[PDB]
Write an enzyme that holds these catalytic residues in place. Structure first.
Site, PDB file in Angstrom:
ATOM      1  N   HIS A 151       0.799  -1.219   0.000  1.00 30.46           N
ATOM      2  CA  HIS A 151       0.000   0.000   0.000  1.00 30.46           C
ATOM      3  C   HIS A 151       0.835   1.273   0.000  1.00 30.46           C
ATOM      4  O   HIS A 151       0.264   2.361  -0.132  1.00 30.46           O
ATOM      5  CB  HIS A 151      -0.947   0.016   1.205  1.00 30.46           C
ATOM      6  N   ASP A 175       1.064  -8.532   2.053  1.00 31.98           N
ATOM      7  CA  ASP A 175       1.091  -7.107   1.730  1.00 31.98           C
ATOM      8  C   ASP A 175       2.518  -6.562   1.771  1.00 31.98           C
ATOM      9  O   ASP A 175       2.779  -5.491   2.323  1.00 31.98           O
ATOM     10  CB  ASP A 175       0.186  -6.315   2.676  1.00 31.98           C
ATOM     11  N   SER A 235       4.399   2.904   8.251  1.00 32.59           N
ATOM     12  CA  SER A 235       4.412   1.504   7.857  1.00 32.59           C
ATOM     13  C   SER A 235       5.742   1.153   7.200  1.00 32.59           C
ATOM     14  O   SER A 235       6.339   1.965   6.488  1.00 32.59           O
ATOM     15  CB  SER A 235       3.257   1.209   6.903  1.00 32.59           C
TER      16      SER A 235
END
Lengths: 151, 49
Positions: free
Chosen positions: A28, A50, A102
């Site tokens: 992402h 992810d 992140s």
């Protein structure tokens, strides 16, 4: 440096880190890594976790962080300070970290990476983190508290 | 002709053998793929738990 910011339009969207000889970044996180040596690497899409990953160039092999699966309950360090891990859950005080954080690694008392942060859940006075960790057998797994927002 | 021809009147035993092999082989290969996908899903589940 072993952590490299990811920027799409000049703003920091996330961070990349070199763990065990591989470059890690979340799916992402959009943008390009500031280090051209890493940005030019073709990354595999591990949609199961992810995470995008690739092989560290020979010129960058020295900038690699050691990792371990031995993560006993206690306190761990990261770029925003201490991190508390208990009951198979990673938690930080509310307000410590947010969107853009992140991909940061979490290090133990020996400087070994134990987890990669994907997001988190604000639980009152504390925020629970979504992290990619290795189980007691060293197998990569994704821990996601219900309602976790990707950072 | 004193008889009546049907759709499968001309299909020989060898023709049925090949039809069965092609249909069964393709079906079995599809099932193998689906089974492998489900089994790996369970393997990942056990990895988390």
């Amino acid at each position: 440096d072993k952590t490299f910011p990811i920027m799409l339009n000049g703003q920091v969207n996330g961070y990349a880190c070199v763990v065990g000889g591989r470059v890690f970044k979340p799916l992402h996180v959009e943008g390009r890594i500031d280090n051209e040596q890493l940005a030019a690497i073709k990354l595999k899409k591990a949609s199961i976790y992810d995470l995008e990953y690739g092989d560290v160039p020979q010129c960058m092999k020295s900038d690699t962080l050691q990792y371990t699966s031995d993560k006993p309950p206690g306190f761990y360090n990261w770029h925003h300070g201490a991190v508390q891990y208990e009951n198979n859950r990673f938690t930080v005080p509310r307000g410590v970290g947010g969107k853009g954080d992140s991909g940061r690694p979490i290090l133990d008392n020996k400087g070994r990476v134990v987890a990669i942060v994907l997001g988190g859940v604000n639980e009152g006075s504390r925020t629970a983190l979504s992290v990619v960790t290795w189980n007691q057998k060293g197998v990569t797994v994704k821990d996601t508290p219900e309602g976790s927002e990707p950072w | 002709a004193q008889h009546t021809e049907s759709f499968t009147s001309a299909i020989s035993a060898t023709a049925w053998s090949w039809i069965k092999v092609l249909v069964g082989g393709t079906s079995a290969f599809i099932v193998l793929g689906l089974i492998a996908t489900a089994v790996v899903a369970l393997v990942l589940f056990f990895h988390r738990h």
